[PDB]
């Protein structure tokens, strides 16, 4: 009965005590510089200490355009595509997040409430601004030039700094975690004119002759040390630590003009957010190829059937700007989509135009029970 | 004072409603028309659950048919696509009755930044003004047609978490009335030298500008699946018996270097005040004002400030300045509440006063249905 | 199983209501407008007695302003005067949410013949198409204006004698919502070579066709003078707590000679299924299909049939055919899985064009739960 | 009290037993061929046997157009006007139906659910179709030509094959029934251009020179023989046999534009159906001269106030097509109009246009108690 109500209360209290008694630490775990032509997949081994909240991954790169005459220009995702995929496994080898660099980056932005680690432009005469180039990439790389890029990704375990749901307790020696990073290479980073720019960093007539010179990464692990001890050992939020907070993405196809394309939510998960990217056969449009988007439950009842601009308006309230062309966001944080609470639910897109090889790339943020 | 009990209960009921019901935003009406034929519409909301507000989307195409002269956006621009709004609840009681520009400025004050705007940053990832949510061409050249988009949020409930002012509409069949008066060919275009206050574009080609058409879509935001208990629906009675309204007014009689005082009425709890100094058609960036203040009779000013310092307080609220001649005052944490008519007044001591000068006031307030 | 008692009571109450109340059909709203300005309307029904449904009359004048080219009716024609309909009851629960053409096809399936049509006979007495109840010019020549009339029945109650799905509205003041989205100058006319699925007319002069105006009148059908007993109103509680809805969906991913399966959801008791094979804008009379069927996982097909034989079953239901539109009657034994996808609707296509898809339409019963 | 409830039950049981035990028979009663220029009124004497359900009357005719140059064309009612009036009296000389051939025919159609005895057109390659010309008349009869017509009318006593309400027990020797048939003649059958075509069969510029050559009728009597006998003699549905099921028609005038023309129902009768023919001064229009039609009760409360097309829609659900121009039908079979059950009721027509000599021809189908 009220056995869980007491469980919930115990969890929250334990969380509050851990946060107040422990001290946060962020420390470098590993750094490596390489040429992706040699190797692009790396398995980083996080340190086993206290409760792990997440990882901040710094990525830098140098790209050279050796085309004789043509330039290349940033794609809509640009440096967010420096990391193609990220996968994390905890000490019990349970997989948490497994998604694309672009999806992880869009969630980082959604959680910040503004473009992740960006520098806002203001009229201040004091010289604040893009001083440190935290996330940066040249808009174009001309024939014969070399550009430098910097990108950051936060790989979460814990939901936030104050909500430890999804965090990982790593104090078991001989049982390691694994943070796998799959980086871009010359094949994924450069798209020829007319090719699909989805996974690319630069696109243009000089693409065939573009090459990475090097990529470097530094992984910083954020955790809580000096865990509080009481009468039974460590005071720990048991629900928090046995819940997985994950990001995952998938691709759905089968769109036809003026027909509702419905992507069912894969039940049991508590979906906090949904990102839908309309890759219209390599074309990414600013809503003009869509009639409306919506979230619908078993009853054909729509809770937010909106035209594209109005849908975008809701997102502007969340991140103070629009996501790139063809990228749509839906916040369900306060009331996560959870089938079994109200029948099957689906994310809906009714397309106005559908090109060949059209598809919806879905990105989800969700909570689910461990084991 | 059984009030503590009433408030304690109200707040608990509000939380149960927010926790148990489910939010819905739904289109209730769309229409396209030519301002030459009509510009006043009465939208009928759906009578379902607890209504929180209405999101009104307005799009328009404006053609500058002038032979050689262009026109440029006024300071309010697309915010003048809707001239006025009035809302009547199922009990025939009015809530908001104000201008489109005042409604828009409050939307901005409540968001803490220009309403539904896209902030500019150094991000290399292509975030930005991708969807043109609120948009209008800076100028429309002779012979050109410009496309505009504007959004307004007409609030009933104070916010997503504070249901004060919300309307229970699952109640009687009696209809709600959301009245909208749109800009027309007579209000949208101002000739050079004319007052641009209510206009969208001003310039030498104004006389030959016209609307090709205007379209609006109203979305209703409400809470459905209301929680039921012993006695029935669990409802925040104080929230639902309180009105959260925006209203505007105009005052004249300004004289150089003399305090011009606009009295606040009693009974109303004023959350914010906006004062626009329409200096005879000229809108200046504080240079025509000595100071502004809020004053209580026999207790002097609580914030007598020079225009720039007054603007500094506003920058802390919306992260930028409101347009020229528009002044904002936040009293949300401690609402102006006189108890005696005029115990408190809004003050403007003008430096220069042109012919036909006046202050256009805008208020946000709470008041009991009594 | 106190269900027998519940059902026994429900049925008795239904009969008392039908016997004691009096049927009323009443106009609730009429409006004339220009699609260029607006095409979406929210009609507010009257909250009185037990509501059975709404008869929606739609008239329109279409002008072909093209200089020299005509246009001709698409296969659905005036059935596309209404693009979509949605109904919300006083409790904010949705019932039907579907397209105008699907609603029309169900109206036909329920009548047992083309809805509100005039059958042709050899009678010398001048019966016939006298009143043009549902009517539209086969073609509208360049410079001409055609007049159209269309009717749709939006059901709440299943029929005149089965009140399952009906709505009690004498109840709270909370309003009902009948949302109607009409055709407009962007949906009603299809250019040669364009998909005519949602259009009314198609042809060389389409780009210059436009609505002069559209008018609609909604009539509400309900039962008044409800019978009262000891405890009060004698009402069929099962009927009134059950939803009778029509809904549509779209599915894509068809491949030549491969079974394309559209799963039925659980909980719903599906009375009928309509599948439209929009073969990339082409609508064929079964020639692009190998067979259609309804199948249960691990129990094979209950009716795997060639297109003509499938059509033969439909001819027994509506006395004619319904190009590219396929119907399936499961009224006596509704598809009810209990487990999502235990049953699916199957189409094995012979030829699949670019942008092919199946537009599904369903009639079902489900508890308000 | 429940004395009638037991009476109703006894009646139904008796009816069920009669239907199951007796055997239906349909037999010719009389046939005659004549020239209506000689005689047009005939009193047919039905045979007194068992329970009589009704009469099927076959009528054929030959018409010649001897005009020098002009043709004539069928009116909207055409062959339905071969019989002008029909009147039936039972063995006690109680009158049952007394109405026009056209009204009787429209009720025959309403009861069939389709144009009476018509042949439906289909795509069948097998040669079904109008093979036997059961009801038939040439669309036109050219100058100098002779056309042949066939018409059938069912004169009901019993309401239907299964509901014996209105049937007549005729087993009393020396007490005969009377079926009076008043046929068309040269005066009623042919209308000149511009004349009122209501009662005519053909109208056209050749009308003055049209003549019947002959008319023939054959009356078939439908009855139940071998009536079941029990403990008290014949088992008979006493309520059924003492109830009259009749058709009657009348004409009402006094119509003025945009004003409600109300025809009150003549109380006590249980009106099963109502037919209203808007003879607008000889003009019969397809609803264009009417604003709306309705049935209204004492309370100005309308139960079905409908525009003409919507009214027609309800009729299309009943007979699968529309009745001829200016003919409107109203079904009240399941809940017969019965004043004394809910105040006075009226049939309403609000005309948009009213020509000189305009009138409403009302046709009623009803049940009433005998004696």
């Amino acid at each position: 009965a009220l056995r869980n109500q007491q469980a919930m209360a115990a969890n929250l209290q334990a969380r509050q005590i851990v946060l107040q008694q422990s001290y946060p630490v962020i420390q470098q775990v590993e750094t490596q510089t390489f040429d992706p032509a040699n190797r692009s997949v790396f398995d980083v081994t996080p340190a086993n200490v206290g409760i792990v909240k997440g990882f901040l991954v710094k990525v830098t790169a140098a790209i050279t355009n050796n085309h004789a005459t043509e330039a290349v220009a940033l794609t809509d995702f640009g440096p967010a595509n420096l990391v193609q995929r990220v996968i994390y496994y905890d000490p019990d080898n349970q997989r948490h997040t497994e998604t694309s660099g672009w999806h992880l980056h869009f969630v980082n932005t959604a959680k910040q409430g503004a473009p992740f680690l960006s520098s806002m432009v203001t009229d201040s005469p004091i010289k604040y601004g893009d001083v440190m180039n935290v996330i940066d990439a040249p808009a174009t790389i001309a024939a014969g030039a070399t550009g430098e890029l910097t990108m950051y990704y936060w790989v979460p375990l814990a939901y936030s700094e104050t909500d430890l749901t999804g965090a990982v307790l790593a104090n078991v020696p001989q049982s390691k975690q694994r943070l796998k990073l799959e980086f871009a290479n010359n094949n994924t980073a450069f798209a020829a004119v007319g090719a699909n720019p989805l996974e690319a960093i630069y696109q243009g007539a000089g693409a065939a002759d573009c090459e990475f010179e090097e990529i470097s990464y530094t992984v910083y692990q954020s955790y809580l040390d000096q865990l509080p001890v009481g009468q039974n050992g460590y005071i720990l939020p048991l629900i928090d630590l046995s819940t997985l907070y994950n990001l995952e993405n998938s691709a759905q196809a089968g769109l036809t003009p003026n027909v509702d394309f419905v992507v069912q939510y894969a039940n049991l998960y508590r979906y906090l957010s949904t990102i839908a990217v309309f890759d219209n056969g390599g074309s990414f449009n600013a809503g003009t190829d869509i009639n409306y988007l919506s979230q619908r439950t078993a009853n054909f009842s729509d809770t937010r059937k909106l035209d594209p601009k109005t849908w975008a308006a809701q997102t502007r309230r969340r991140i103070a700007t629009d996501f790139p062309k063809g990228v749509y966001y839906c916040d369900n944080r306060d009331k996560p989509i959870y089938t079994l609470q109200y029948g099957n639910v689906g994310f809906v897109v009714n397309p106005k135009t559908v090109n060949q090889n059209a598809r919806l790339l879905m990105g989800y943020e969700y909570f689910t029970s461990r084991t």
Side-chain angles (χ1 to χ4, degrees), chain A residues 1 4-173 175-230 233-266 268-298 301-370:
Chain A
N4 78 64
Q5 206 184 316
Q6 299 168 61
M8 285 293 297
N11 182 68
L12 178 54
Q13 179 188 68
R15 181 197 295 172
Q16 302 178 313
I17 286 174
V18 160
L19 293 174
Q20 308 201 69
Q21 299 299 310
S22 67
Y23 195 76
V25 174
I26 182 168
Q27 61 176 55
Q28 175 169 316
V29 167
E30 170 175 309
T31 301
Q32 205 157 339
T33 298
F34 61 95
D35 182 330
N38 294 334
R39 181 187 175 194
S40 63
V41 179
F42 295 78
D43 189 322
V44 181
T45 300
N48 282 340
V49 178
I51 292 172
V52 187
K53 293 149 64 188
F55 308 87
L56 183 61
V57 185
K58 174 186 184 183
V59 185
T60 63
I63 288 170
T64 295
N65 175 354
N66 287 309
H67 191 91
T69 61
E70 308 284 355
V72 289
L74 282 173
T75 56
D76 291 351
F77 295 4
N81 276 331
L82 272 167
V83 164
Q84 290 285 290
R85 298 183 38 179
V86 177
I87 311 91
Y88 173 85
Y89 296 84
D90 62 32
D92 297 313
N93 204 47
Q94 165 59 257
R95 198 197 63 178
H96 292 229
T97 283
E98 165 139 30
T99 199
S100 59
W102 59 259
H103 177 222
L104 176 61
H105 168 64
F106 289 151
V107 170
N108 287 165
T109 286
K111 302 269 291 290
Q112 180 170 322
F116 189 63
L117 299 183
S118 60
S119 171
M120 175 186 51
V121 176
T122 81
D123 74 338
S124 188
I126 288 97
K127 305 198 181 179
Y128 295 97
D130 175 14
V131 172
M132 294 295 298
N133 286 287
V134 178
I135 288 187
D136 164 64
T140 60
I141 298 181
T146 296
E148 299 291 337
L149 330 216
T150 304
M151 181 64 193
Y152 278 82
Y153 301 87
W154 167 254
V155 182
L157 291 187
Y159 182 66
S160 70
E161 289 297 304
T162 58
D163 182 344
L164 299 178
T165 301
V168 171
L169 180 60
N171 53 39
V172 173
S175 190
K176 71 179 194 305
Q177 306 162 63
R178 289 172 190 275
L179 177 62
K180 296 183 61 175
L181 300 172
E182 307 187 357
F183 293 91
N185 58 25
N186 295 340
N187 296 329
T188 72
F190 312 113
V193 174
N196 193 330
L198 176 68
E199 301 299 334
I201 301 172
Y202 283 93
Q203 174 169 47
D209 293 307
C210 285
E211 292 176 273
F212 275 103
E213 293 287 11
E214 62 163 42
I215 292 181
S216 185
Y217 71 76
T218 298
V219 173
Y220 286 93
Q221 184 173 319
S222 174
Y223 62 93
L224 301 177
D225 218 4
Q226 290 188 47
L227 300 180
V229 179
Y234 289 151
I235 293 174
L236 308 166
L238 299 175
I239 300 179
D240 283 8
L241 304 172
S242 60
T243 300
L244 306 179
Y245 165 49
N246 308 336
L247 274 66
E248 288 197 69
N249 70 304
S250 54
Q252 309 299 317
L255 297 112
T256 59
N258 306 126
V259 176
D260 282 359
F261 189 70
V262 182
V263 184
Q264 293 291 310
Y265 282 89
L268 288 56
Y269 291 167
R270 295 141 63 187
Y271 299 85
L272 304 160
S273 83
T274 301
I275 284 178
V277 180
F278 189 8
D279 167 11
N280 209 348
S283 287
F284 294 81
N285 300 301
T288 59
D289 52 3
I290 295 176
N291 292 307
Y292 59 77
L293 301 87
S294 187
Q295 274 189 317
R296 173 182 302 166
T297 62
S301 185
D302 298 282
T303 54
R304 53 175 292 164
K305 177 180 166 193
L306 315 168
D307 65 88
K309 275 201 184 185
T310 302
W311 182 281
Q314 308 304 317
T315 287
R316 283 198 181 192
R317 296 279 290 189
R318 303 295 186 177
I319 62 161
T321 187
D322 302 318
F323 276 103
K325 293 187 306 183
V327 181
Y328 303 94
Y329 175 71
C330 189
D331 178 325
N332 292 294
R333 300 176 189 286
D334 288 344
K335 293 178 185 300
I337 295 302
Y338 183 53
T339 64
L340 301 185
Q341 192 182 71
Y342 35 48
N344 313 300
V345 181
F347 183 88
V348 184
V349 175
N350 184 303
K352 174 182 178 175
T353 305
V354 181
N355 303 318
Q356 177 170 298
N357 297 315
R359 58 181 178 167
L360 281 193
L361 306 172
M362 307 298 298
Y364 306 101
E365 197 183 333
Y366 69 79
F367 286 150
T368 193
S369 287
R370 171 193 293 287

